[PDB]
Amino acid sequence: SSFLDALGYLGSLIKDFKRRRFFLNKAHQRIRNKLGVSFAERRSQIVSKYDRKIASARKPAIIVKLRQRKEKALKALDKMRVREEKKMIREFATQAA
């Protein structure tokens, strides 16, 4: 009987399990939302910055170099996005482990 009425301790402990998991999930989830919004705004900023010059360039070398610089910036930010997302998945998996 000492064990049996000590067996109830499962309920609180499993509640702590599922609850703390909910805690970790929402923490990672807001991390993901924040970083995704970060990437989207970085894109919008860079594309607007380059399109302001693209709108009135009308010179082949200038417009082509502006497009090259914009594409390079987008490629760098894109590498950032992909490495971030893969490492975020790996991070959340490490958390769960």
C-alpha positions in Angstrom: 0.0 0.0 0.0 2.9 2.3 0.7 4.0 1.8 -2.9 0.4 2.0 -4.3 -0.5 5.3 -2.8 3.0 6.3 -3.9 2.2 5.2 -7.4 0.0 8.2 -7.9 3.1 10.3 -8.5 2.9 9.3 -12.2 0.1 11.8 -12.9 2.0 15.0 -11.8 5.3 13.7 -13.4 3.7 12.9 -16.7 1.9 16.2 -16.6 5.3 17.8 -16.2 6.4 15.8 -19.2 3.7 16.9 -21.6 3.6 20.5 -20.2 7.3 21.0 -20.5 7.3 19.6 -24.0 4.5 22.1 -24.8 6.8 24.8 -23.4 9.8 23.7 -25.6 7.6 23.4 -28.7 6.2 26.9 -28.3 9.7 28.3 -27.6 11.1 26.8 -30.8 8.0 27.8 -32.7 8.3 31.5 -31.9 12.0 31.2 -32.7 11.0 29.9 -36.2 8.4 32.6 -36.7 10.8 35.4 -35.6 13.6 34.2 -37.9 11.3 33.7 -40.9 9.9 37.2 -40.5 13.5 38.3 -40.3 14.4 36.7 -43.6 11.3 38.1 -45.3 12.0 41.6 -44.2 15.7 41.3 -45.2 14.5 40.2 -48.7 12.0 43.1 -49.0 14.7 45.6 -47.9 17.3 44.4 -50.3 15.0 44.1 -53.3 13.5 47.6 -52.7 17.0 49.1 -52.3 18.1 47.7 -55.6 14.8 48.3 -57.4 15.1 52.0 -56.5 18.3 52.2 -58.6 16.9 49.8 -61.2 13.8 52.1 -61.8 16.0 54.9 -63.1 19.3 53.4 -64.4 18.5 52.9 -68.2 22.2 52.2 -68.8 23.3 48.6 -69.7 26.4 48.3 -67.5 24.8 50.0 -64.5 21.6 48.1 -64.6 23.3 44.7 -65.2 25.8 45.4 -62.3 22.9 46.4 -60.1 21.1 43.2 -60.9 24.3 41.2 -60.3 24.8 42.8 -56.9 21.1 42.2 -56.0 21.4 38.6 -57.0 24.6 38.2 -55.0 22.9 39.6 -51.9 19.8 37.4 -52.4 22.1 34.4 -52.8 23.9 35.2 -49.5 20.7 35.7 -47.7 19.3 32.5 -49.2 22.3 30.5 -47.9 21.6 32.1 -44.6 18.0 31.1 -44.7 18.7 27.5 -45.7 21.5 27.0 -43.2 19.4 28.6 -40.5 16.4 26.3 -41.2 18.5 23.1 -41.3 20.3 24.0 -38.2 17.1 25.0 -36.5 15.6 21.5 -37.2 18.8 20.0 -35.9 18.7 22.2 -32.8 15.0 21.3 -32.1 15.9 17.6 -32.5 18.7 18.0 -30.1 16.3 19.7 -27.7 13.9 16.8 -28.0 16.6 14.2 -27.5 
